[PDB]
Amino acid sequence: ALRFITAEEAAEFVHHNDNVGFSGFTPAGNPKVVPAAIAKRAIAAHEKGNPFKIGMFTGASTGARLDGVLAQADAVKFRTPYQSNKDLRNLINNGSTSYFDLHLSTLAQDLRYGFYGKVDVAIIEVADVTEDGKILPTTGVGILPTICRLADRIIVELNDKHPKEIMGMHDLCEPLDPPARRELPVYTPSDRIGKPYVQVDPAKIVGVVRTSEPNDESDFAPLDPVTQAIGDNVAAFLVSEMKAGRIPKDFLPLQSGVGNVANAVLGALGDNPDIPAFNMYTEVIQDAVIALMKKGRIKFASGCSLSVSRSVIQDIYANLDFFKDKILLRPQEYSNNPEIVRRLGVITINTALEADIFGNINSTHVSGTRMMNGIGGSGDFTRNSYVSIFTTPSVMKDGKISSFVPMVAHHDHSEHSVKVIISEWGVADLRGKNPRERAHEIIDKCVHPDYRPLLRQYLELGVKGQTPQNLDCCFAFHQELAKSGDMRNVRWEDYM
Amino acid sequence: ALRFITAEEAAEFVHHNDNVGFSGFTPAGNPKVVPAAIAKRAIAAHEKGNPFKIGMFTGASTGARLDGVLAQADAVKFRTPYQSNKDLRNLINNGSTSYFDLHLSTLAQDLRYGFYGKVDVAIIEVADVTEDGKILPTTGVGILPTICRLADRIIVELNDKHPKEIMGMHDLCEPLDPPARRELPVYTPSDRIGKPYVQVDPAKIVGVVRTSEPNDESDFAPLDPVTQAIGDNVAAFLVSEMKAGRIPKDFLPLQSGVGNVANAVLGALGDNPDIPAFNMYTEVIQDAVIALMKKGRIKFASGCSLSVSRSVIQDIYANLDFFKDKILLRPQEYSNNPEIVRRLGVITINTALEADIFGNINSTHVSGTRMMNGIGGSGDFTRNSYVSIFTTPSVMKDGKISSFVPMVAHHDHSEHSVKVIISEWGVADLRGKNPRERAHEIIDKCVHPDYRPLLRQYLELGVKGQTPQNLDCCFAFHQELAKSGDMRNVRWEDYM
Ligand SMILES: [Zn+2]
Ligand SMILES: [Zn+2]
C-alpha cells in the first residue's frame, strides 16, 4: 500500500550521483518541500567531507525551493533543460556546475532514446495519487510522464491546495519511438490524445509526503509605455496581415512568452476588435490569458503549465464550471511539438535579449557570455510557426544600451527562422528580403533613433558579399558598453 | 488541345517582372532549353534600353542552363531558396541581385500562405504530359506541385531521355493548410501518400516544347585519405551507438548531403557489416546510394531528386524491374519535413564549412560574408534528426586554414541543434555537455593538432560566464587568414 512519510524520510531515497527528474513546468507543478530536505542532507554530507551532487532533469524553471535551495547547497552535478533562479544562474556563470539548455520539446524523447543516462528517482507534486498508481498532476506537466516511466523510484508530494476535481485538465501520454512512432493526433488546439492521469506501478512509489502549498500572489506589475507600444504594434500587424491575405481570416493559434511585453501583447489583442476570439497553443498560461478568457476573448488555452497568481488560481478552482473545458495542460513534448506547431499554423511571439540588423536573435547570453535562462521553447516555436515574431524594447539602461547590434554576441535564432521583429518604434517584416534589405528595414522601423545612423554607417564600411559583417568591428557595440558604459560612444573609425 | 511550340515561342510568355517557378531539385528535373531562350530575350531587351528581370522560385540548385544563363543575362530580380552556380553566386556576392536562402521544406507552404507574391508562370521538365493535364516529372520534384497549382500559365518541356515507364517513382501532393491541415501519413520511408503525377487544368499549358537532354556523366571523383577517414569514423560511431543502446538495433533512416565526404560515409556504411541493410530518407539520391542499392546494402531510397550520372540513370531506366519499387521521389515539402524527419528518427549527416569549439556550425558564408550555396535542408534535418552529425576535414589550404575556429563567422546551426561533429581525427559527441566541456571534446577529437593548443589557450583568456567567448578576439583566426594567409600565425597576445 501507499506509504506516507516526511520530507526528511523521503530525502533519504536520494543519494549522491543519483539523477533526479522533477515534475512541473515553471514553479507550477513542482515539488516544494522534498528538494529542500535533500539540500539539508547534501550540506550535511559536504561538511562531513563526503561528496553529494545529483543530476537534474526538469520540465523548465522551478521555484527557489528547488533550484535555489539545491544551488545554495552546491549539490548540482548537472542541470537541464531550462532554469530561471538567481542562485543556480550564478552557480552556472561562475562555472561551478554543468548546465546545458535544450529545445524543451526534445528532452522527453531523448531521455527515452537513452541520450542522457538513467533517471534514478522522480519527485512529483500531485493533486491525487491512487493506490493502483494513478497520478494526477497539479498546475504544470513538463516531462512528468517520462520521468515517472524511466525512474527507479518515485517520491510523491500530495498538495492540499490542488483539488482532484482538476481531473480532466491534463492530457498525458507519450508516443511510440522510432521506428514505430505514429502521428500525434492533434489537429485543433483543444484535441485530447492521452489520459487525464499518468499510470505507474505503485511499487515504485517509495513514499507520499503530504503538503499544503498555495500559489504565490501577483507581485508588482507596473505598466510601461514602451511595452504598451510594442503590444499594440503586434496586434495591429496581425490584423493587418489577415486583411492582406497572409493569415486566414479566422486567425490562428497563438503562442507567447511570459513577461510584461507578452502581457501587453495579449491585452492589445483582446482590445483590438479586428482580432477574432482566439485560442492559445502556448507553453505557459498566465493571468493575462485567464483575464481574456473570462471576457470570452480567448476561447481555449493549450499549454504545459498554468502559471497564475493565487487570486487567479482560486478563481479557477472555484469555477471549474467555466475553466475546466477551456484549459488543457500537456507535456512539453506535445505543447512545444514541431509537428503540432507547424500543422496548426501556430503564430509565435517571443522576446529577444538582443537582435542584429540581419534578423538573428540572442535570447540567452548577456554580452555573449553570461547565461540568462535558456533557449527554452523559443526554438521549437519560432522555427516552425506560421509566422515567427520577436519583440523587444529598442533600448536599455536609459538608452546607453541598444537592443539592436551589428552582430548578436550569441546566436539562438537565425536569419532563416526569424520572420518579423517588433519594437515600440514599428515592425520589420523580414520575409522575402536579403541581408541588406532586412537591415535597412530593421534600422528604419525597429532601431531606436539614437542608433539608427550608426548602424547605417556599419553597412557602408566597404565589406563585400552577401552579408556585410565586418569581423574587425562587428562587436564594437558590446565592446564600447564595456569600455564607456554607453554604446552611443561608438565611432567606426575608432574600431578600425 | 496541347500546343507544341519552340523554346523561343515559349519564352514570349515570360515578361519582365514576372515571377517564375521552375520544376526539379538540383539540375535534375529542371527545364534546360526555355530558360536560355528567356535569357536571349532578356538581353535583347537590355541593350534596347528596356528592363528585364524575373523573380525566381526553384526547388534547390539548377543547371548552368538555368541560373547560369539567367545570371549572365543579368535578369534575376530575386532568387530563392537555394542556388549552386558560379555566375549566379558572383552576381549575388557582388550585390547585383537579391537572394535569400530558406529552409527547403518551407517554401511550398509559404508560397501558398502568400508570403512571397504571385507565381506568374511555371516552367517544368516532364517525362509525359497528358491532354487532360496530367504531369509526370522527371528526376527531381522540388516545389513542382505548388508552382503548377499557383502559376497563371505553365510551360512544359517534354524530354526524350526520360521514359513514361517511370510512372510510379514519384509521390506527389500537398497538404491542406491551417487551420485545416491533417497529419502527413508517412510512418516508413517508403510510404506513399499522394499520386504518381500532378493534375492541372490543361488550359494553363501555354505550350509543350520537345527536348532530348541526357544526364551529364560522372566527372573526376578522386579518393582522399581525409574523407576515407571521416567516412569510417561516421560508420564506426553509428555501430558503436547501436551497441551502446542509443540507436535501435535495426538502425534508422539516413540522410546525407552530396559530395566526397558523403560518398565516403555511404561507402563506409556499406562496408561495415555491423551496419544493417538500411533505407534513405534524404534530399538527393546520388550514385553512391544506387551502388549500395544494387548490392542490397540499401533497401530503399526516399528523396526529392535522383541526381545520378548518365551511366547510372541509364542502368536504372534499363532495370525499372529492380529500381522502380526501391526509389521514391517526393516534393521537398515532404522529403525535408520536420514532422516526418522527427517521427521516423532520421539520422542526419551534413557538412560544415567551418565549426567552432562550442558546437555551432557555418554551412554557407566564407569568412562570414561570401555566400556559398544556401542553408539548404541542413536545418530541416539537423534540427529534427534522431541524432545530428556534422562532418568536415579538420583543415584546408595545406593546413593554413582551420575548419575549427573560436567562433563561426556565420551561424547556420546552433549549439542546441548540433549533436555530433566528426573529422578525420575522431568524433566529438556533444550531447550532455556544456560549452567548456564540448570545446575540450571538439579540440581533443576533431581539431587538427596544429590548432589544438591555440584553441586550448583561447579557453584560458580570463572570460567569465557560461560561454567563454572573447569578443575582443573571437575572430582572430579569420582576421589572421586575411592578414598572413595562415591561421597558425595567431598569438592571442597579438589580438589583445
Ligand atoms: Zn544558445
Ligand atoms: Zn545563414
mmCIF file of C-alpha atoms in Angstrom, chain A residues 92-93 97-103 105-106 109 113-116 178-179 181-183 187 245-246 248 252 337-339 342-345 365 367-369 371 375 379-380 383-384 386-387 407 409-412 414-417 431-435 437 463-467 469 471-472 474-475 478-479 483, chain B residues 92-93 97-101 103 105-106 109 113-116 178-179 181-183 187 245-246 248 252 337-339 342-345 365 367-369 371 375 379-380 383-384 386-387 407 409-412 414-417 419 431-435 437 463-467 469 471-472 474-475 478-479 483:
data_model
loop_
_atom_site.group_PDB
_atom_site.id
_atom_site.type_symbol
_atom_site.label_atom_id
_atom_site.label_comp_id
_atom_site.label_asym_id
_atom_site.label_seq_id
_atom_site.Cartn_x
_atom_site.Cartn_y
_atom_site.Cartn_z
ATOM 1 C CA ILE A 92 26.393 28.326 -13.555
ATOM 2 C CA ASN A 93 28.038 31.554 -14.700
ATOM 3 C CA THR A 97 28.287 23.321 -12.306
ATOM 4 C CA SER A 98 27.347 21.903 -15.718
ATOM 5 C CA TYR A 99 24.299 23.348 -17.417
ATOM 6 C CA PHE A 100 23.040 22.783 -20.940
ATOM 7 C CA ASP A 101 19.801 24.319 -22.212
ATOM 8 C CA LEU A 102 17.835 22.316 -24.755
ATOM 9 C CA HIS A 103 14.843 22.797 -27.016
ATOM 10 C CA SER A 105 10.141 19.631 -26.835
ATOM 11 C CA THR A 106 13.110 17.256 -27.200
ATOM 12 C CA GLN A 109 12.136 11.510 -26.199
ATOM 13 C CA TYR A 113 16.448 7.294 -26.527
ATOM 14 C CA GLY A 114 19.000 6.972 -23.738
ATOM 15 C CA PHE A 115 20.889 10.131 -24.717
ATOM 16 C CA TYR A 116 21.189 11.267 -21.109
ATOM 17 C CA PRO A 178 11.130 5.175 -33.935
ATOM 18 C CA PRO A 179 10.873 3.162 -35.982
ATOM 19 C CA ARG A 181 6.167 6.209 -33.998
ATOM 20 C CA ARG A 182 2.770 7.210 -35.372
ATOM 21 C CA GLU A 183 1.420 10.735 -35.853
ATOM 22 C CA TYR A 187 -5.469 18.929 -35.378
ATOM 23 C CA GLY A 245 -4.373 37.715 -47.023
ATOM 24 C CA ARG A 246 -1.244 36.436 -45.276
ATOM 25 C CA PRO A 248 -6.506 33.218 -42.604
ATOM 26 C CA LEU A 252 -4.646 31.030 -35.955
ATOM 27 C CA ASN A 337 5.953 19.855 -30.655
ATOM 28 C CA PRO A 338 7.271 20.943 -34.090
ATOM 29 C CA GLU A 339 4.757 18.637 -35.790
ATOM 30 C CA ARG A 342 3.588 23.637 -37.877
ATOM 31 C CA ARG A 343 0.395 21.717 -38.618
ATOM 32 C CA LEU A 344 -1.837 24.107 -36.680
ATOM 33 C CA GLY A 345 -0.030 27.115 -38.096
ATOM 34 C CA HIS A 365 23.557 35.242 -23.272
ATOM 35 C CA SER A 367 27.302 40.078 -23.870
ATOM 36 C CA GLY A 368 27.512 36.588 -25.336
ATOM 37 C CA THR A 369 28.926 35.014 -22.172
ATOM 38 C CA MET A 371 23.741 32.769 -19.283
ATOM 39 C CA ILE A 375 16.733 28.917 -25.155
ATOM 40 C CA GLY A 379 13.345 27.489 -30.926
ATOM 41 C CA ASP A 380 10.622 24.822 -31.043
ATOM 42 C CA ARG A 383 11.374 27.592 -36.223
ATOM 43 C CA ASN A 384 8.017 26.009 -37.056
ATOM 44 C CA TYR A 386 3.204 30.090 -39.370
ATOM 45 C CA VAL A 387 4.974 33.428 -38.885
ATOM 46 C CA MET A 407 26.025 41.109 -34.776
ATOM 47 C CA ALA A 409 27.043 38.180 -29.232
ATOM 48 C CA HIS A 410 25.219 34.835 -29.131
ATOM 49 C CA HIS A 411 23.057 33.242 -31.821
ATOM 50 C CA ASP A 412 19.899 31.437 -30.694
ATOM 51 C CA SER A 414 18.980 32.590 -37.344
ATOM 52 C CA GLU A 415 18.032 34.797 -40.288
ATOM 53 C CA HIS A 416 16.350 31.721 -41.757
ATOM 54 C CA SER A 417 13.951 31.391 -38.855
ATOM 55 C CA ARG A 431 10.200 37.924 -45.274
ATOM 56 C CA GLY A 432 11.429 37.975 -48.855
ATOM 57 C CA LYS A 433 14.442 40.121 -48.017
ATOM 58 C CA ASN A 434 18.173 39.567 -48.301
ATOM 59 C CA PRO A 435 20.622 40.699 -45.564
ATOM 60 C CA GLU A 437 17.275 44.828 -47.290
ATOM 61 C CA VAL A 463 32.608 44.896 -46.754
ATOM 62 C CA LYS A 464 31.909 42.769 -49.826
ATOM 63 C CA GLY A 465 29.494 39.864 -50.016
ATOM 64 C CA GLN A 466 26.012 38.566 -49.292
ATOM 65 C CA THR A 467 26.311 39.599 -45.615
ATOM 66 C CA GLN A 469 29.565 41.786 -41.474
ATOM 67 C CA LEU A 471 34.778 40.946 -38.498
ATOM 68 C CA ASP A 472 37.088 43.749 -37.325
ATOM 69 C CA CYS A 474 31.018 43.700 -35.548
ATOM 70 C CA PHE A 475 31.195 43.634 -31.722
ATOM 71 C CA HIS A 478 29.313 45.338 -26.933
ATOM 72 C CA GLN A 479 32.944 46.348 -26.614
ATOM 73 C CA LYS A 483 34.591 50.487 -22.119
ATOM 74 C CA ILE B 92 24.876 37.672 -55.583
ATOM 75 C CA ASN B 93 28.153 38.340 -53.737
ATOM 76 C CA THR B 97 20.675 40.818 -57.167
ATOM 77 C CA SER B 98 18.520 39.787 -54.202
ATOM 78 C CA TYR B 99 18.988 36.296 -52.836
ATOM 79 C CA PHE B 100 17.581 34.746 -49.689
ATOM 80 C CA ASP B 101 18.187 31.102 -48.791
ATOM 81 C CA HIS B 103 14.845 26.042 -45.144
ATOM 82 C CA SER B 105 10.838 22.264 -46.547
ATOM 83 C CA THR B 106 9.119 25.632 -46.004
ATOM 84 C CA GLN B 109 3.569 26.164 -47.923
ATOM 85 C CA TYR B 113 0.322 31.274 -47.462
ATOM 86 C CA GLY B 114 1.050 34.179 -49.800
ATOM 87 C CA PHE B 115 4.314 35.125 -48.083
ATOM 88 C CA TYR B 116 6.076 35.636 -51.424
ATOM 89 C CA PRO B 178 -4.077 25.651 -41.401
ATOM 90 C CA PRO B 179 -6.419 25.584 -39.720
ATOM 91 C CA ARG B 181 -4.139 20.614 -42.032
ATOM 92 C CA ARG B 182 -4.121 16.922 -41.147
ATOM 93 C CA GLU B 183 -1.086 14.747 -40.424
ATOM 94 C CA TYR B 187 5.422 6.255 -40.936
ATOM 95 C CA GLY B 245 21.776 1.364 -26.827
ATOM 96 C CA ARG B 246 21.500 4.909 -28.173
ATOM 97 C CA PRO B 248 17.758 0.950 -32.123
ATOM 98 C CA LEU B 252 17.145 4.142 -38.585
ATOM 99 C CA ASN B 337 9.545 17.679 -43.499
ATOM 100 C CA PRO B 338 10.284 18.222 -39.768
ATOM 101 C CA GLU B 339 7.241 16.114 -38.843
ATOM 102 C CA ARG B 342 11.461 13.530 -36.298
ATOM 103 C CA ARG B 343 8.780 10.828 -36.361
ATOM 104 C CA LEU B 344 10.962 8.371 -38.344
ATOM 105 C CA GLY B 345 14.000 9.226 -36.269
ATOM 106 C CA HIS B 365 29.299 32.022 -45.617
ATOM 107 C CA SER B 367 34.639 34.407 -43.758
ATOM 108 C CA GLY B 368 31.076 35.256 -42.774
ATOM 109 C CA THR B 369 30.381 37.399 -45.834
ATOM 110 C CA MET B 371 27.629 33.316 -49.836
ATOM 111 C CA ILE B 375 21.437 26.675 -45.812
ATOM 112 C CA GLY B 379 18.393 22.964 -40.921
ATOM 113 C CA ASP B 380 15.217 20.949 -41.647
ATOM 114 C CA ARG B 383 17.158 20.340 -36.088
ATOM 115 C CA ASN B 384 14.785 17.353 -36.059
ATOM 116 C CA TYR B 386 17.329 11.471 -34.033
ATOM 117 C CA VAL B 387 20.989 12.463 -33.779
ATOM 118 C CA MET B 407 33.505 31.480 -33.191
ATOM 119 C CA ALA B 409 31.845 33.888 -38.839
ATOM 120 C CA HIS B 410 28.264 32.924 -39.704
ATOM 121 C CA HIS B 411 25.824 30.850 -37.663
ATOM 122 C CA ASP B 412 23.595 28.400 -39.533
ATOM 123 C CA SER B 414 23.386 26.348 -33.046
ATOM 124 C CA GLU B 415 24.815 24.512 -30.036
ATOM 125 C CA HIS B 416 21.249 23.415 -29.274
ATOM 126 C CA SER B 417 20.917 21.574 -32.564
ATOM 127 C CA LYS B 419 24.763 16.810 -31.513
ATOM 128 C CA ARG B 431 25.323 15.590 -26.042
ATOM 129 C CA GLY B 432 25.033 16.282 -22.341
ATOM 130 C CA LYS B 433 27.879 18.785 -22.351
ATOM 131 C CA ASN B 434 28.067 22.469 -21.518
ATOM 132 C CA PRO B 435 30.140 24.929 -23.605
ATOM 133 C CA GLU B 437 33.109 20.502 -21.934
ATOM 134 C CA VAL B 463 36.493 35.352 -19.861
ATOM 135 C CA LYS B 464 33.762 34.771 -17.277
ATOM 136 C CA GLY B 465 30.433 33.084 -17.893
ATOM 137 C CA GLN B 466 28.581 30.117 -19.364
ATOM 138 C CA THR B 467 30.264 30.665 -22.755
ATOM 139 C CA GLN B 469 33.755 33.833 -25.969
ATOM 140 C CA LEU B 471 34.548 39.457 -28.109
ATOM 141 C CA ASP B 472 37.926 41.182 -28.473
ATOM 142 C CA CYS B 474 36.924 35.585 -31.245
ATOM 143 C CA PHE B 475 37.544 36.268 -34.955
ATOM 144 C CA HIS B 478 39.600 34.709 -39.707
ATOM 145 C CA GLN B 479 41.382 38.019 -39.290
ATOM 146 C CA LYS B 483 46.485 39.249 -42.826
#
